[PDB]
């Protein structure tokens, strides 16, 4: 597991597309919607299996003659020449959560809080924000609890970090302006119920110069393919979720001028490209031969 | 690359990817301000003035067609717009023109007709109108018939020309 120098690009990792696919199949077997409506319209009505998915971990291990490499440097931005490299038989256990604006029950960056983009400066691109210290989210339907206390300290690390990428600047947490309900709010899967939180409410903070109102919904859009999937209704009165947060998906406005003379950048949550969730766990891993 | 859309109407700008495959794509206006873009399957609206009445067609994306539709078009909406896919910049210029009659309805003889053309900030405007009659009067910036006629009732058509494209407004007439 000797020192060698190679470039890893998480943004072009060939496996995530595979891993993203493997997740789609895991889903076909586990949560089968009663109804899929797709574009004529191709549609089938079936009696549902009603089997919840309770996040079984998956290993994509390197096939025959192909090696999975890991990157050594302690903090690595998404695209970089990596100074030190090890080799591993298998990717580690991966818990696959299909999530938005939040990354769930995941992996934590150890010393520094790291922001990875195919381009960070890119005015357009999804931003991962891999985190050093984690937080707890518990929900009941009803309401969701995020500690009031955790946010002011976390305000600090971010106020400390962003400026360093974007110096002499002022920072906004603002709710998402438009788009679909899954993007608008935090989409996630707990126990065969799909959840949205108007977290528009949560980022209401601006910088330097707390309970979420979740909805339980049985008809939902699919991340998987374009369209709507319908899942049958709930047998029990009350449901428990404990989740831990390891991360974020983010975008900020830019706007490139117009005597706004704005000091500001506004970052709004984000998500919906499933492959990015898959990317935050898998960015270190790479598949090669010889 | 220029197309023209009538005021109050619905217009669509076209975007093409290299292979009939879904690609993350996103949309921008003359300032690098975001209208509409997508995440995989899901859709989102940019913080531009436009966001609502900014919407694109979903069905298309597997082919790799990622259109921008502005509907309930406004004059101020005319802009040069740029769609980004697989690191390509494709651009289209959109201008909005509107025609209007002097007043709402029921105009009778000796009375006079004025059509006015509102053109977006900074553009050339010339007008051709064929009367229901077909006598053709070329107003240019506004068209006036000083005194009105029997011949004149019914629906007649004006043409506005920019970037060598013509757009039709037809005005229904009661005399």
């Amino acid at each position: 597991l000797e020192n060698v120098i190679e470039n890893f690009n998480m943004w072009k990792n060939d496996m995530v597309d595979q891993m993203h696919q493997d997740i789609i199949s895991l889903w076909d077997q586990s949560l089968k919607p009663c109804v899929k409506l797709t574009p004529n319209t191709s549609t089938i009505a079936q009696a549902c299996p009603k089997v919840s998915f309770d996040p079984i971990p998956i290993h994509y291990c390197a096939p025959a003659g192909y090696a999975i490499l890991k990157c050594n440097d302690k903090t690595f931005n998404g695209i970089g020449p990596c100074n030190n490299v090890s080799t591993v038989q298998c990717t580690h256990g991966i818990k696959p959560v299909v999530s938005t604006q939040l990354l769930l029950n995941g992996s934590l960056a150890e010393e520094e809080v790291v922001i990875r983009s195919e381009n960070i400066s890119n005015n357009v691109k999804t931003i991962i924000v891999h985190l050093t210290e984690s937080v707890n989210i518990t929900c009941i339907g009803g309401h969701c609890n995020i500690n009031e206390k955790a946010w002011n300290e976390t305000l600090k690390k971010v106020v400390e970090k962003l400026v360093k990428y974007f110096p002499n600047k002022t920072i906004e947490f603002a709710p998402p302006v438009g788009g679909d309900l899954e993007i608008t709010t935090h989409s996630f899967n707990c126990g065969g119920e799909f959840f949205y939180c108007n977290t528009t409410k949560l980022f209401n903070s601006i910088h330097n110069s707390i309970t979420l109102p979740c909805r339980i919904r049985q008809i939902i859009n699919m991340w998987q393919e374009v369209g709507r999937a319908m899942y049958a209704p709930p047998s029990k009165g009350n449901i428990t979720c404990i989740s831990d947060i390891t991360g974020l998906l983010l975008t900020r406005d830019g706007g490139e001028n117009k005597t706004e003379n704005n000091d500001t950048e506004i970052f709004r949550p984000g998500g919906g490209d499933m492959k990015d969730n898959w990317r935050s766990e898998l960015y270190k891993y790479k598949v090669v031969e010889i | 690359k220029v197309v023209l859309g009538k005021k109050g109407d619905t217009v669509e700008l076209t975007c093409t990817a290299s292979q009939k495959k879904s690609i993350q794509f996103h949309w921008k206006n003359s300032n690098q301000i975001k209208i509409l873009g997508n995440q995989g399957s899901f859709l989102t609206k940019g913080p531009s003035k436009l966001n609502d009445r900014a919407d694109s067609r979903r069905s298309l994306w597997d082919q790799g067609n990622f259109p921008l539709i502005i509907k309930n078009l406004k004059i101020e909406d005319s802009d040069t717009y740029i769609c980004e896919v697989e690191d390509q910049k494709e651009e289209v210029q959109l201008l909005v023109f509107g025609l209007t009659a002097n007043s709402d309805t029921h105009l009778l003889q000796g009375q006079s007709l004025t059509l006015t053309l509102e053109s977006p900030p900074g553009s050339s405007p010339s007008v051709q109108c064929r009367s229901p009659r077909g006598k053709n009067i070329q107003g240019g910036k506004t068209l006036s018939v000083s005194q009105l006629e029997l011949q004149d009732s019914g629906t007649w058509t004006c043409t506005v020309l920019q970037n060598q494209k013509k757009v039709e407004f037809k005005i229904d007439i009661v005399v």
Partner: antibody
Amino acid sequence: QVQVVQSGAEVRKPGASVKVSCKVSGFTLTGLSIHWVRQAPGKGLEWMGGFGPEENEIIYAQKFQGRVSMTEDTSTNTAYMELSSLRSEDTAVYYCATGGNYYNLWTGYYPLAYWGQGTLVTVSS
Amino acid sequence: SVLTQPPSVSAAPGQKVTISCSGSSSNIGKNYVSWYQQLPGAAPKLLIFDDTQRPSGIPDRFSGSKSGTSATLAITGLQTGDEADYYCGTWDSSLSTGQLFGGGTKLTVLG
């Protein structure tokens, strides 16, 4: 053929729920398919509810919010509507509406393509 | 939160006639307009959907248009048979409100 059938006309005492069936022949109801609309005698169309761009809801207009429940069973291929806590004004003709033979991924967008015969409810002292 | 159309309209048996409904960018500018024909004491039928699209079995006499924040229904060769009441439907984005109907108009042809 395509068909819509509504259940027989019915009479109610103020304060009692009413439940009205719909059966659809010629397609399998998507479950996003159906909107319930009723007409007062002598009056124009009033829309009670149906599915909307908010996913969890098949959504009901405000006048009807405390009291009304709408259903489609994708399997029996019929839809049921209950309006409860009845009023003098509620007598009207309740109509079952469906979209079809249209692409409704948009789902937000279908037209009300097939209409039922209409079914009548009158509420009285 | 409400559409308006006229309460009444009339015409000769040869003659063309139109019914116009107007709303707000909150309902109509944003969304599609479809039209419903209601015959004497019968369930309402979809005369028109998606602004200009006529469904099967409607004759070509019927037409539709949309522009600005109002939409227009057009009729030609009007028939004794065409007597009925017409309603304009638009799905609406703002507030809760959902699907909305204008009051509608009763059209009469003079026989």
